[PDB]
Amino acid sequence: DPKDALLRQFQKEIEELKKKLEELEKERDFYFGKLRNIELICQDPVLQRIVDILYATDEGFVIP
Amino acid sequence: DPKDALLRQFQKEIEELKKKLEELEKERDFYFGKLRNIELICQDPVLQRIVDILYATDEGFVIP
């Protein structure tokens, strides 16, 4: 049945996507961990701007 | 054919995982963007420690 081989291919694709998801979560958590460690240091005009970026709802290019 | 409905379910799972991947890339890039903006500000003992975290190969809990 050609559908058997397609089912096997789809299962492999699902497994590969799940792996990519785990890798992407790791990358996200790595950058988040650095931001948290910087915030711990922060807890100075320069330092205030860094805090403003940390708490910004966006990336922090424009701080109002 | 019961295999038809399983193929449809697998295709939907693939589509849902691809969506989750895009969302996770967005979250990763958001935190990365904040780190880059902080590094631009950095470019002071406190500020040096922040730079050390930015350039650390890990999260930066221990800076040698």
Side-chain angles (χ1 to χ4, degrees):
Chain A
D1 195 335
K3 293 176 187 170
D4 293 345
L6 188 56
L7 280 166
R8 181 177 62 188
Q9 188 178 64
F10 281 4
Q11 173 75 61
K12 185 66 177 176
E13 183 69 11
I14 284 157
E15 290 175 21
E16 287 174 359
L17 290 167
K18 284 184 195 294
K19 174 162 143 212
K20 289 191 187 69
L21 278 175
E22 171 228 20
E23 294 172 337
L24 262 166
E25 289 192 0
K26 286 285 160 112
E27 281 167 16
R28 181 200 63 190
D29 292 350
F30 177 81
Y31 294 138
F32 175 85
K34 282 188 165 186
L35 286 168
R36 177 169 51 195
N37 282 343
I38 293 169
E39 201 269 356
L40 279 196
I41 295 298
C42 292
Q43 287 195 54
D44 196 325
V46 177
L47 209 59
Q48 183 56 59
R49 174 51 198 281
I50 288 171
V51 167
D52 289 344
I53 293 164
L54 289 172
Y55 282 82
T57 60
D58 60 8
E59 291 79 4
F61 290 110
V62 172
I63 304 293
Chain B
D1 195 335
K3 293 176 187 170
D4 293 345
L6 188 56
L7 280 166
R8 181 177 62 188
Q9 188 178 64
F10 281 4
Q11 173 75 61
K12 185 66 177 176
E13 183 69 11
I14 284 157
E15 290 175 21
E16 287 174 359
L17 290 167
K18 284 184 195 294
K19 174 162 143 212
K20 289 191 187 69
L21 278 175
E22 171 228 20
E23 294 172 337
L24 262 166
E25 289 192 0
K26 286 285 160 112
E27 281 167 16
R28 181 200 63 190
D29 292 350
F30 177 81
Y31 294 138
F32 175 85
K34 282 188 165 186
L35 286 168
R36 177 169 51 195
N37 282 343
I38 293 169
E39 201 269 356
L40 279 196
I41 295 298
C42 292
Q43 287 195 54
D44 196 325
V46 177
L47 209 59
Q48 183 56 59
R49 174 51 198 281
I50 288 171
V51 167
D52 289 344
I53 293 164
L54 289 172
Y55 282 82
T57 60
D58 60 8
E59 291 79 4
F61 290 110
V62 172
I63 304 293

